[PDB]
Amino acid sequence: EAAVTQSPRNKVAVTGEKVTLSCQQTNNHNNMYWYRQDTGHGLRLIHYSYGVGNTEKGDIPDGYEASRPSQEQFSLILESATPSQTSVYFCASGGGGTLYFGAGTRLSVL
Amino acid sequence: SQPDPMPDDLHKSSEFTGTMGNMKYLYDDHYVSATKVKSVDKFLAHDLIYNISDKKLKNYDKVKTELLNEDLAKKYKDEVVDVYGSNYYVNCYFSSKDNVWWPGKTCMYGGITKHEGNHFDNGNLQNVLVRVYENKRNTISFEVQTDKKSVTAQELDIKARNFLINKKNLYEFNSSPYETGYIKFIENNGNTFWYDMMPAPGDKFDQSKYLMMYNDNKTVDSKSVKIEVHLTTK
Ligand code: NA
Ligand code: NA
């Protein structure tokens, strides 16, 4: 099984639409993370979580909320999608000296 | 009767720079509830473990409730009780190591009342009035309901905050519309006590440490108790 599954893998949204990205891990790590990729650069942290019912702000939290309702699931929420949020998004789960990534979500906000 | 709060006694949301969703989480459609249960285990002298299954998601099948001390735990250990309280998972532990995941388990404080003789004479509910003040003005009032004659302050508090999250955005994901807030209970005998509703200053919010205030298992008479919520803005 894939250590981390993301859904959707591809998304086209209209400006002002509510978009939710799901990340499902299978290793039940305490820590989960949502990143967006700076095109041709690095990953930028949006929100992360230390466990169920916890979320913390990363380096670029504005425009996004997050939810950790269970050990396996970490959701990223764009309450009102803006064009600047067009990007590739990667979820990760980590713990016990491991860090796994999802295969990425391409989101386009027209 | 506890001394009433001075503005310097109250936590300010403007001084909390973390995620208010972590406080919201504890009160927004969130609680453990079970009827007619008896404890099955303990971790430490002051705690009790119950077989209670999650009725929202499937996150747990056992609940550890921590009491103030071992004598309070001994009060309830072999009793048939009902349970109602706010549960947490981060730093929910059953050994000396802090960050261990304990699958199938959740943690809370207090929330226990004897079952027998504690219900109204027809499965009926008791209303408890909550008066809400915003900048000293009573702008909104509502009732919370309980099946219990003697009900934990914790249960009433959770019900009030859940309502106020929904109707007044008491807590939002980032911050709160309110600067300060406290919930005050007024008992028939004149006794008063209150809890600070806002997180401690800084970046992190320690859910376990916040909820520890409920460990006294304080109960009130639902038929006669009064509740006031006092909020200030900005
Ligand atoms: Na009792
Ligand atoms: Na919100």
Ligand code: NA
């Ligand atoms: Na917010």
Ligand SMILES: [Zn+2]
């Ligand atoms: Zn009962």
